[PDB]
Amino acid sequence: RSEQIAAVRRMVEAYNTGKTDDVADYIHPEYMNPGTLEFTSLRGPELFAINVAWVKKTFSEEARLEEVGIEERADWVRARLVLYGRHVGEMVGMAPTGRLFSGEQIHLLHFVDGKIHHHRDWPDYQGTYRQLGEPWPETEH
Amino acid sequence: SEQIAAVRRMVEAYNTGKTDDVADYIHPEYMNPGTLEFTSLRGPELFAINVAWVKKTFSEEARLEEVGIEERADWVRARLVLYGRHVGEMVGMAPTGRLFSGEQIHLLHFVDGKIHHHRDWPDYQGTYRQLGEPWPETEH
Amino acid sequence: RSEQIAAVRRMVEAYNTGKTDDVADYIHPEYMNPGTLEFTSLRGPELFAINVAWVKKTFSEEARLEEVGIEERADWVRARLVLYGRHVGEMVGMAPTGRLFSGEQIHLLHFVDGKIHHHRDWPDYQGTYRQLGEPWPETEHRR
Amino acid sequence: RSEQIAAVRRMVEAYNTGKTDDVADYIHPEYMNPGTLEFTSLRGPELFAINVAWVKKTFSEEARLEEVGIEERADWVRARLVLYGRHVGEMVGMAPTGRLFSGEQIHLLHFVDGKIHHHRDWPDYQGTYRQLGEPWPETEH
Numbered sequence: 001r002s003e004q005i006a007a008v009r010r011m012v013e014a015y016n017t018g019k020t021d022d023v024a025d026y027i028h029p030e031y032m033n034p035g036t037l038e039f040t041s042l043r044g045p046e047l048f049a050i051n052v053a054w055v056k057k058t059f060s061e062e063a064r065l066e067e068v069g070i071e072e073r074a075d076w077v078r079a080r081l082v083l084y085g086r087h088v089g090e091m092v093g094m095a096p097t098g099r100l101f102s103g104e105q106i107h108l109l110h111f112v113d114g115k116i117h118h119h120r121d122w123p124d125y126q127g128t129y130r131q132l133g134e135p136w137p138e139t140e141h
Numbered sequence: 142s143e144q145i146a147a148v149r150r151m152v153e154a155y156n157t158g159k160t161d162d163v164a165d166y167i168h169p170e171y172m173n174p175g176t177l178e179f180t181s182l183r184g185p186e187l188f189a190i191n192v193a194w195v196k197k198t199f200s201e202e203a204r205l206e207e208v209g210i211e212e213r214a215d216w217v218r219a220r221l222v223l224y225g226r227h228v229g230e231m232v233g234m235a236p237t238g239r240l241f242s243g244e245q246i247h248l249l250h251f252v253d254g255k256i257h258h259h260r261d262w263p264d265y266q267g268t269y270r271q272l273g274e275p276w277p278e279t280e281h
Numbered sequence: 282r283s284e285q286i287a288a289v290r291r292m293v294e295a296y297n298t299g300k301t302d303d304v305a306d307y308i309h310p311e312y313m314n315p316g317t318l319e320f321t322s323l324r325g326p327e328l329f330a331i332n333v334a335w336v337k338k339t340f341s342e343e344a345r346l347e348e349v350g351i352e353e354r355a356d357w358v359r360a361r362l363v364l365y366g367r368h369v370g371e372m373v374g375m376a377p378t379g380r381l382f383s384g385e386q387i388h389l390l391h392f393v394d395g396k397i398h399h400h401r402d403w404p405d406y407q408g409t410y411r412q413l414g415e416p417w418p419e420t421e422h423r424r
Numbered sequence: 425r426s427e428q429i430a431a432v433r434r435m436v437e438a439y440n441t442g443k444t445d446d447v448a449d450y451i452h453p454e455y456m457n458p459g460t461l462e463f464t465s466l467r468g469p470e471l472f473a474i475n476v477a478w479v480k481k482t483f484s485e486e487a488r489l490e491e492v493g494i495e496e497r498a499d500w501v502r503a504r505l506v507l508y509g510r511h512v513g514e515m516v517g518m519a520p521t522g523r524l525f526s527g528e529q530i531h532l533l534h535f536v537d538g539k540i541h542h543h544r545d546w547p548d549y550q551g552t553y554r555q556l557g558e559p560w561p562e563t564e565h
């Protein structure tokens with residue numbers, strides 16, 4: 001039973017439930033996610049919490065992250081997930097399209113001190129954009 | 142457009158699984174080359190078997206969502222997204238019970254005001270990944 | 282060194298070179314690919330040879346199949362390949378677009394009696410279609 | 425003739441040739457690309473030139489960006505492109521694999537004062553990652 005994978009599964013559940021009160025349990029104080037850089041300078045558990053909140057706000061409370069597979073190698077975990085949502089909040093300067101979508105994701109996670117220290121994820125941006133009807137942005141984010 | 146209306150009825154038939162009225166919009170000589178592996182049937186009967194297979198393989202809850210539909214003369218292009226769960230044998234791959242969703246592009250040719258030729262391109266590789274990349278147990 | 286994997290690499294090399302003199306070495310007499318049922322009733326090394334020729338005709342002599350990875354499990358091989366080409370011949374009723382494209386592919390091959398007996402391949406149809414400029418078919422026929 | 429589309433085509437040409445001496449002609453002094461934030465805090469023509477350099481360093485001098493289609497709506501341009509390269513440089517902590525790859529991209533560009541002022545680019549991250557043999561990162565750094 002991998003502690004690393006169990007922690008990643010808690011992370012996934014956070015996206016599903018939206019509940020982030022306990023994230024300090026598995027999110028390192030120095031947690032970073034380069035994908036968040038455009039939105040905030042926060043780090044650690046508060047950074048992960050703001051990501052989860054953004055997901056529920058933008059892609060609906062009913063947004064789901066489904067697990068396809070999770071593997072590990074030393075202090076690293078690779079998660080193959082699928083995001084299901086509906087576009088209901090402003091997304092980087094694109095007005096809500098109200099469109100359903102689903103997009104595969106690959107996540108790379110690095111563990112330090114038994115907690116998630118670095119988190120990179122690659123949404124299916126283009127696939128999502130297509131399913132959103134390829135909206136034209138209304139403003140720069 | 143009556144053509145776009147017909148394609149929307151086709152999409153609904155996948156969603157409801159109800160194929161009693163398909164002769165309304167499916168040409169007697171309807172062909173879908175993607176079906177050749179499974180059957181030699183044509184027309185409304187062929188379309189119905191395709192719909193039945195989707196419900197059997199991808200669950201009763203399988204549905205097609207519309208992204209967009211375009212037309213040009215006697216042709217329609219439908220940009221759709223299939224949502225389902227792999228519950229039935231899929232060309233020799235055993236049921237995985239896994240959820241999946243994959244964009245699709247459908248090209249439809251109308252003759253005599255009905256759908257005469259139908260090509261569709263599922264996201265085979267994306268679906269395969271979401272199904273955990275199963276190894277086939279047999280040749281279809 | 283897997284003989285099955287070696288056979289699949291010979292298959293890939295045939296698409297690359299267009300050289301098919303020796304395909305009977307590794308293609309089963311009863312070889313079938315369900316994806317080409319629309320085009321011909323051929324089977325065996327004969328079917329494979331014409332499929333290779335069609336690729337070179339439709340996607341140019343310079344069309345390439347690059348290997349990402351190949352794995353095997355008992356009598357089955359899974360090949361992760363990438364096709365590169367330029368669309369220069371009629372393709373299912375769509376006129377040549379002259380467009381460069383590249384698309385990942387997943388191939389599933391079943392061996393029987395030491396030769397490739399069943400071959401299923403999944404091109405990135407939609408990705409390819411996008412890169413071709415999403416052409417409208419001119420005919421539902423071959424033309 | 426669209427001056428905007430012409431400008432975006434000069435941008436595309438810069439990725440292809442690696443020739444960036446004239447980028448100030450079409451890149452706004454305040455040009456930003458949020459995709460670059462992990463790597464640099466630069467803005468303007470300098471940021472664009474750095475991006476081009478990184479592409480050539482990481483994906484080889486032979487890297488090419490092919491045009492599928494470009495459209496515009498008011499002060500916005502959408503470019504549908506395809507990147508071709510070979511993974512020859514360290515890529516966010518993943519060692520060079522020497523592997524060929526090609527992946528579609530969608531770019532969204534906003535013009536201000538007749539120059540490219542904001543640039544968002546969605547590579548096919550997952551498809552590229554696959555073609556690179558899904559490498560495990562050697563560092564987070």
Ligand SMILES: CC[C@@H](O)C[C@@H](O)c1c(CC(=O)OC)cc2c(c1O)C(=O)c1c(O)cccc1C2=O
Pocket residue numbers: 035036039050051052054055083091092105121123124125126128129
């Ligand atoms: C706080 C800032 C963020 O939370 C936004 C950022 O998280 C974000 C995410 C979160 C994520 O990585 O997957 C759950 C996803 C997307 C995005 C995102 O900013 C996107 O911006 C995005 C897009 O512009 C076009 C298509 C798809 C997407 C996304 O899928």
Ligand SMILES: CC[C@@H](O)C[C@@H](O)c1c(CC(=O)OC)cc2c(c1O)C(=O)c1c(O)cccc1C2=O
Pocket residue numbers: 459460463464474475476478479507515516545547548549550552553
């Ligand atoms: C200054 C540094 C940057 O320029 C890096 C950034 O360019 C970057 C680019 C540039 C790009 O937009 O293509 C024309 C592409 C990728 C990436 C990138 O940082 C990637 O990081 C990347 C990846 O991690 C996995 C798969 C693909 C990619 C990229 O395709």
Ligand SMILES: CC[C@H](O)C[C@@H](O)c1c(CC(=O)OC)cc2c(c1O)C(=O)c1c(O)cccc1C2=O
Pocket residue numbers: 173175176179190191194195231232261263264265266268269
């Ligand atoms: C009647 C039986 C059929 O025609 C099977 C066939 O419908 C079929 C469909 C339905 C369709 O859209 O083609 C018209 C979809 C898939 C498939 C299919 O046979 C697949 O076989 C399939 C697969 O093997 C791996 C991933 C995805 C798929 C499919 O999405």
Ligand SMILES: CC[C@H](O)C[C@@H](O)c1c(CC(=O)OC)cc2c(c1O)C(=O)c1c(O)cccc1C2=O
Pocket residue numbers: 314316317320321331332335336372373402404405406407409410
């Ligand atoms: C004899 C005629 C043929 O066999 C056509 C057939 O070869 C074919 C191949 C080759 C192959 O993968 O078969 C084993 C590839 C494609 C296709 C094909 O017929 C396609 O039709 C096709 C398409 O309509 C839209 C996008 C992509 C493709 C293909 O990539």
